Amino acid sequence: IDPFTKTSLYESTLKNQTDLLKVTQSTVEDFRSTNQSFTRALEKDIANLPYQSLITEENIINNVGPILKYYRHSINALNVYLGLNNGKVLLSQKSMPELRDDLDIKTKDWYQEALKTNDIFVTPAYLDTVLKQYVITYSKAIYKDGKIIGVLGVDIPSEDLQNLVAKTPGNTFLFDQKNKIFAATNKELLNPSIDHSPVLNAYKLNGDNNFFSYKLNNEERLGACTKVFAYTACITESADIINK
Ligand SMILES: CC(C)[C@H](C)[C@H](N)C(=O)O
Ligand code: NA
Numbered sequence: 690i691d692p693f694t695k696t697s698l699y700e701s702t703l704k705n706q707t708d709l710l711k712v713t714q715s716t717v718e719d720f721r722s723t724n725q726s727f728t729r730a731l732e733k734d735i736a737n738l739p740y741q742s743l744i745t746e747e748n749i750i751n752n753v754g755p756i757l758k759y760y761r762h763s764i765n766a767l768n769v770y771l772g773l774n775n776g777k778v779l780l781s782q783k784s785m786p787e788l789r790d791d792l793d794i795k796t797k798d799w800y801q802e803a804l805k806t807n808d809i810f811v812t813p814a815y816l817d818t819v820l821k822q823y824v825i826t827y828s829k830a831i832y833k834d835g836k837i838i839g840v841l842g843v844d845i846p847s848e849d850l851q852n853l854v855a856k857t858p859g860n861t862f863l864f865d866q867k868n869k870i871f872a873a874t875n876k877e878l879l880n881p882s883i884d885h886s887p888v889l890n891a892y893k894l895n896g897d898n899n900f901f902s903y904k905l906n907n908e909e910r911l912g913a914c915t916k917v918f919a920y921t922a923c924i925t926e927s928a929d930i931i932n933k
């Protein structure tokens with residue numbers, strides 16, 4: 690009851706929950722950066738091949754194919770591939786790499802968007818065309834001496850990130866770009882019929898990392914969210930710690 694005591698409990702729990710939110714933020718960050726570093730290394734190894742090894746399709750198969758395969762295995766990626774301007778893609782898939790002409794690669798965001806930036810492009814999660822798993826794709830237009838070779842893609846199962854987030858301490862969770870729930874420590878929050886408005890509205894009012902109160906079934910809860918890339922990361926807890 691004494692306001693000194695309530696303030697002490699509030700300040701403690703704000704610190705604790707902030708810390709835990711930041712661990713889930715770090716988890717998302719480190720997943721991305723590891724995948725980006727991998728993709729960058731692969732780009733470098735492909736671009737360091739002589740032009741002769743890159744300028745016929747049979748040479749791409751025989752010289753780039755093994756690189757795609759070893760890299761895929763190193764990280765247990767689902768697919769690793771190189772898309773060419775003739776519409777063919779050299780594909781190393783979890784199951785030697787094949788040059789596929791039937792995958793409509795120029796319709797794909799991972800292909801188109803890699804040509805519009807000099808960075809790595811990271812897709813939202815989507816259902817892979819070939820293996821029918823949900824993946825996050827990292828793509829990169831590879832140039833040698835300023836000349837485009839093709840677009841590299843690396844597909845990592847989105848489950849990998851979901852699992853990493855779920856293992857974190859705290860009642861933390863992630864929304865995707867469209868404010869749909871994406872990952873959670875408590876698997877029940879993944880019910881698509883849960884309304885997240887209260888938290889999402891309190892986030893909009895308060896901003897990144899700003900602790901707020903809200904109600905659930907007439908009881909008080911405390912939480913915070915923050916943007917992490919296109920995701921929104923949140924933590925919530927009961928306010929019993931400060932009230933009882
Ligand atoms: C090669 C390319 C078609 C991949 C299978 C990519 N994950 C996609 O679904 O667009
Ligand atoms: Na890294």
Ligand code: NA
Pocket residue numbers: 727763764
């Ligand atoms: Na690796």
Ligand code: NA
Pocket residue numbers: 713854855856857858859860861862874
């Ligand atoms: Na957690």
